[PDB]
Design a protein around this motif. Structure first.
Motif, PDB file in Angstrom:
ATOM      1  N   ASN A   1      61.232  41.352  60.633  1.00 57.11           N
ATOM      2  CA  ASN A   1      61.685  39.945  60.451  1.00 57.11           C
ATOM      3  C   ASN A   1      62.004  39.697  58.976  1.00 57.11           C
ATOM      4  N   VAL A   2      61.185  40.198  58.091  1.00 57.95           N
ATOM      5  CA  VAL A   2      61.439  39.993  56.637  1.00 57.95           C
ATOM      6  C   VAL A   2      61.964  41.304  56.022  1.00 57.95           C
ATOM      7  N   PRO A   3      63.202  41.345  55.577  1.00 55.82           N
ATOM      8  CA  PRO A   3      63.780  42.574  54.960  1.00 55.82           C
ATOM      9  C   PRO A   3      62.885  43.137  53.853  1.00 55.82           C
ATOM     10  N   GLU A   4      62.064  42.310  53.262  1.00 56.41           N
ATOM     11  CA  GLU A   4      61.169  42.801  52.176  1.00 56.41           C
ATOM     12  C   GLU A   4      60.296  43.938  52.709  1.00 56.41           C
ATOM     13  N   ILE A   5      60.027  44.923  51.892  1.00 58.81           N
ATOM     14  CA  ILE A   5      59.182  46.065  52.346  1.00 58.81           C
ATOM     15  C   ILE A   5      57.881  46.089  51.540  1.00 58.81           C
ATOM     16  N   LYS A   6      56.766  46.246  52.199  1.00 57.49           N
ATOM     17  CA  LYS A   6      55.468  46.279  51.471  1.00 57.49           C
ATOM     18  C   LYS A   6      55.163  47.715  51.040  1.00 57.49           C
ATOM     19  N   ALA A   7      54.537  47.885  49.909  1.00 64.63           N
ATOM     20  CA  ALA A   7      54.216  49.262  49.437  1.00 64.63           C
ATOM     21  C   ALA A   7      53.261  49.932  50.426  1.00 64.63           C
ATOM     22  N   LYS A   8      53.443  51.201  50.671  1.00 66.43           N
ATOM     23  CA  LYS A   8      52.546  51.914  51.623  1.00 66.43           C
ATOM     24  C   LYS A   8      51.101  51.830  51.125  1.00 66.43           C
ATOM     25  N   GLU A   9      50.911  51.826  49.834  1.00 67.15           N
ATOM     26  CA  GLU A   9      49.531  51.750  49.282  1.00 67.15           C
ATOM     27  C   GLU A   9      49.240  50.321  48.823  1.00 67.15           C
ATOM     28  N   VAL A  10      47.985  49.983  48.678  1.00 62.24           N
ATOM     29  CA  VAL A  10      47.624  48.606  48.235  1.00 62.24           C
ATOM     30  C   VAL A  10      46.669  48.686  47.042  1.00 62.24           C
ATOM     31  N   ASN A  11      46.758  47.745  46.145  1.00 63.29           N
ATOM     32  CA  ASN A  11      45.873  47.760  44.944  1.00 63.29           C
ATOM     33  C   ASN A  11      44.402  47.846  45.363  1.00 63.29           C
ATOM     34  N   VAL A  12      44.031  47.201  46.435  1.00 59.85           N
ATOM     35  CA  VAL A  12      42.604  47.254  46.868  1.00 59.85           C
ATOM     36  C   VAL A  12      42.210  48.701  47.175  1.00 59.85           C
ATOM     37  N   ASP A  13      43.028  49.415  47.893  1.00 64.08           N
ATOM     38  CA  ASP A  13      42.687  50.829  48.208  1.00 64.08           C
ATOM     39  C   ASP A  13      42.637  51.640  46.912  1.00 64.08           C
ATOM     40  N   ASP A  14      43.486  51.321  45.976  1.00 65.05           N
ATOM     41  CA  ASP A  14      43.509  52.079  44.691  1.00 65.05           C
ATOM     42  C   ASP A  14      42.149  52.004  43.998  1.00 65.05           C
ATOM     43  N   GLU A  15      41.568  50.842  43.930  1.00 66.01           N
ATOM     44  CA  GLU A  15      40.249  50.716  43.247  1.00 66.01           C
ATOM     45  C   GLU A  15      39.157  51.417  44.063  1.00 66.01           C
ATOM     46  N   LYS A  16      39.127  51.231  45.356  1.00 67.06           N
ATOM     47  CA  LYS A  16      38.071  51.900  46.164  1.00 67.06           C
ATOM     48  C   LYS A  16      38.161  53.415  45.968  1.00 67.06           C
ATOM     49  N   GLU A  17      39.349  53.952  45.966  1.00 62.40           N
ATOM     50  CA  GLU A  17      39.498  55.418  45.770  1.00 62.40           C
ATOM     51  C   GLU A  17      39.030  55.789  44.363  1.00 62.40           C
ATOM     52  N   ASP A  18      39.285  54.942  43.401  1.00 60.70           N
ATOM     53  CA  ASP A  18      38.847  55.248  42.013  1.00 60.70           C
ATOM     54  C   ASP A  18      37.324  55.383  41.987  1.00 60.70           C
ATOM     55  N   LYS A  19      36.632  54.522  42.685  1.00 61.74           N
ATOM     56  CA  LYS A  19      35.146  54.610  42.704  1.00 61.74           C
ATOM     57  C   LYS A  19      34.732  55.951  43.311  1.00 61.74           C
ATOM     58  N   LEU A  20      35.354  56.340  44.390  1.00 63.08           N
ATOM     59  CA  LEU A  20      34.999  57.641  45.024  1.00 63.08           C
ATOM     60  C   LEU A  20      35.279  58.770  44.031  1.00 63.08           C
ATOM     61  N   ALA A  21      36.377  58.688  43.332  1.00 59.58           N
ATOM     62  CA  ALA A  21      36.712  59.749  42.345  1.00 59.58           C
ATOM     63  C   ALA A  21      35.674  59.744  41.224  1.00 59.58           C
ATOM     64  N   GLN A  22      35.195  58.590  40.847  1.00 56.93           N
ATOM     65  CA  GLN A  22      34.185  58.532  39.757  1.00 56.93           C
ATOM     66  C   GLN A  22      32.906  59.236  40.212  1.00 56.93           C
ATOM     67  N   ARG A  23      32.556  59.113  41.464  1.00 59.52           N
ATOM     68  CA  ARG A  23      31.325  59.793  41.952  1.00 59.52           C
ATOM     69  C   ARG A  23      31.517  61.305  41.864  1.00 59.52           C
ATOM     70  N   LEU A  24      32.664  61.793  42.261  1.00 56.53           N
ATOM     71  CA  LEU A  24      32.908  63.262  42.197  1.00 56.53           C
ATOM     72  C   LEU A  24      32.867  63.723  40.738  1.00 56.53           C
ATOM     73  N   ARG A  25      33.544  63.027  39.870  1.00 55.83           N
ATOM     74  CA  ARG A  25      33.543  63.430  38.440  1.00 55.83           C
ATOM     75  C   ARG A  25      32.110  63.390  37.912  1.00 55.83           C
ATOM     76  N   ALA A  26      31.340  62.426  38.336  1.00 59.68           N
ATOM     77  CA  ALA A  26      29.928  62.353  37.874  1.00 59.68           C
ATOM     78  C   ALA A  26      29.178  63.567  38.423  1.00 59.68           C
ATOM     79  N   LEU A  27      29.526  63.991  39.609  1.00 54.56           N
ATOM     80  CA  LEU A  27      28.852  65.175  40.210  1.00 54.56           C
ATOM     81  C   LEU A  27      29.079  66.386  39.306  1.00 54.56           C
ATOM     82  N   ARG A  28      30.253  66.504  38.745  1.00 56.26           N
ATOM     83  CA  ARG A  28      30.539  67.662  37.852  1.00 56.26           C
ATOM     84  C   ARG A  28      30.110  67.319  36.424  1.00 56.26           C
ATOM     85  N   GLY A  29      29.791  66.079  36.171  1.00 51.34           N
ATOM     86  CA  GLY A  29      29.364  65.683  34.800  1.00 51.34           C
ATOM     87  C   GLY A  29      27.839  65.582  34.748  1.00 51.34           C
TER      88      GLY A  29
END
Lengths: 29, 167
Positions: A1-29
């Motif tokens: 209905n709206v020609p506008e296209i939403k990005a496949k990714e969302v800023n909210v998912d970006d931050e949640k993934e960053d937290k998961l990545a921080q845990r892994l880096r801490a595991l090696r740190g």
């Protein structure tokens, strides 16, 4: 209905993934 | 790709059966790096990534302390030393990874050729490419050339199997 296209990714998912990545880096740190 | 990681999870369990937790820790680290280096996939992939995270925490707790019941000090030295010291992890991999490659060649000669062997060849190269890729900065351009040629020999056998022809 709206020609506008939403990005496949969302800023909210970006931050949640960053937290998961921080845990892994801490595991090696 | 994502399926490549799935095969590693199955092979990772096989190593646990042999008691090679050392390779399991190093290969699990490669699995997470593979997902991040993998093209963006639907959320389903994110769900699998969370399960993998549980394996990491479960990996260290995999012992549960039951094995520690005896010689607990020795268990911490082996688990702590090989897991905390990254250099100790690589030499341990070269010992098994190197022996695994030589023994694997004997299996191709003394053992029959099957599709399962092809899958093992892709995983073996991943072990060498993973170690060399991370330590590539520590290898000289010429030294890498010699190691890279060795990979061609392994890939060469892999390519012959793809055509169905045997050296």
């Amino acid at each position: 209905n709206v020609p506008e296209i939403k990005a496949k990714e969302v800023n909210v998912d970006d931050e949640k993934e960053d937290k998961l990545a921080q845990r892994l880096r801490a595991l090696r740190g | 790709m994502a399926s490549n990681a799935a095969r590693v999870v199955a092979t990772a369990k096989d190593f646990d059966k042999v008691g090679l937790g050392i390779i399991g820790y190093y290969l699990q680290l490669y699995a997470v790096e593979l997902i991040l280096s993998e093209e963006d996939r639907s959320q389903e992939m994110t769900a699998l990534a969370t399960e993998l995270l549980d394996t990491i925490e479960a990996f260290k707790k995999e012992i549960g302390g039951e094995s520690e019941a005896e010689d607990s000090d020795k268990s911490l030295h082996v688990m702590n030393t090989l897991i905390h010291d990254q250099e100790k992890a690589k030499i341990y991999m070269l010992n098994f990874t190197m022996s695994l490659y030589n023994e694997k060649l004997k299996q191709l000669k003394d053992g029959p050729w099957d599709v399962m062997l092809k899958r093992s060849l892709w995983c073996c190269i991943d072990l060498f490419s993973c170690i060399l890729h991370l330590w590539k900065e520590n290898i000289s351009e010429t030294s890498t050339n010699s190691l890279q040629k060795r990979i061609k020999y392994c890939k060469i056998y892999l390519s012959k199997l793809a055509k169905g022809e045997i050296g």
